Every structure is written in C-alpha cells, then in structure tokens.
C-alpha cells in the first residue's frame, strides 16, 4: 500500500486535477472497481464510465475551483482524509462549499473508495 507520505501526495494531486478540471486525469486515478459516495449518504457510484459522468456533470462547465484548506491527514493503511473548499456558481449565485474527502488507495496507488462529507449546512453564498 502507499505510504503515509505517498497518500499525502496523491490526495493533493487529486485536488490539483479537480481545480484544473481534467476529467480524464481524475478518472485515471480511480481503480477499476472503485466506488464514489458523494455526498456520503447517497448510493455509491460504481464503474469508470459512471465516475467519469459524475465528474463531467460536476466540473463540465469549468468555473469550479478547489483548494485544500489544511493538510492531508494520512494513515499507515493506505487511507487519508483532507479538508478543502469548492468554489462554484449556482444559478448566478457565487457559492462556496466546504468538503472533507476520505479516500482508500489500493496497492497500485489508485483510489479504491472515495467518500465526500458535505451537505447544505456547508454551503455559503459569497
């Protein structure tokens, strides 16, 4: 499994890819059988095509920005958690969303699970 230092680098790279909006590069970071729960509480998304569709829908228009708001926390069993802020426009209202992602990596450094914690209580109008 990736080391704690490697998890920090992978999760930071993921945020960099979200921020520039490269959907294909993001999808490549996921394992074949990965699941995404975003927001956590909703049914998982499974499969490369469906994960790509989710990022295409979320990031498609451009105008999404994302940045870490504190350090990546990493374990020694290939998992980590990170806090970040997403900036977007929701029907002409510029908004920000505070999120924590929890990720579990496989032995190849790919994302096996992703769980995103947020709800409407984490939304703010700018």
> How far is the C-alpha of 62 from the C-alpha of 21, rounded, in Å?
7
Helices (H), the chain: 4-20, 23-28, 48-59
**Nearer to ligand EQU by C-beta: 1 or 68?**
68
Does 101 show up as a binding residue in the annotation? yes
Between CA 57 and CA 47 the distance in angstroms is: 16
**Smallest distance, ligand EQU to C-beta of residue 14, A:** 7
Measured from the CB atom, is 2 or 21 closer to its own copies? 2
Q: Is 38 annotated as catalytic?
A: yes
Interface residue with its own copies among 25, 44, 87, 118 (CB under 8 A) is 118
Active site residue 14: yes
Phi-psi region of 114 (alpha: psi -120 to 50; beta: other; left: phi over 0): beta
Tokens 């579990």 belong to residue = 104
Q: Which of residues 31-60 bind its own copies (CB under 8 A)?
A: 39-41
d(CA 104, CA 30): 10
Residue whose pair of structure tokens reads 């499994």 in the numeric block:
1
**Judged by CB under 6 A, does residue 58 bind ligand EQU?**
yes
Binding window for its own copies (CB under 8 A); candidates: 16-24, 46-54, 59-67, 81-89: 81-89
**CB of 109 or CB of 118, closer to ligand EQU:** 118
Find the shortest distance in angstroms from Cβ 26 to its own copies: 21
Helices (H) and strands (E) in the chain, counts: 3, 8
As annotated, the active-site residues are 14, 38
């Amino acid at each position: 499994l990736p080391t704690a230092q490697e998890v920090q680098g992978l999760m930071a790279r993921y945020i960099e890819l979200v921020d520039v909006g490269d959907i294909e590069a993001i999808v490549q970071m996921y394992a074949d059988d990965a699941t995404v729960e975003d927001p956590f509480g909703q049914p998982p998304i499974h499969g490369r095509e469906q994960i790509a569709a989710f990022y295409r829908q979320g990031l498609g228009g451009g105008k999404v920005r994302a940045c870490l708001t504190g350090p990546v926390r990493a374990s020694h069993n290939g998992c980590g958690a990170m806090p970040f802020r997403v900036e977007m426009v929701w029907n002409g209202q510029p908004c920000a969303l505070d999120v924590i992602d929890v990720m579990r990596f496989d032995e190849h450094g790919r994302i096996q699970t992703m769980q995103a914690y947020w709800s409407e209580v984490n939304l703010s109008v700018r």
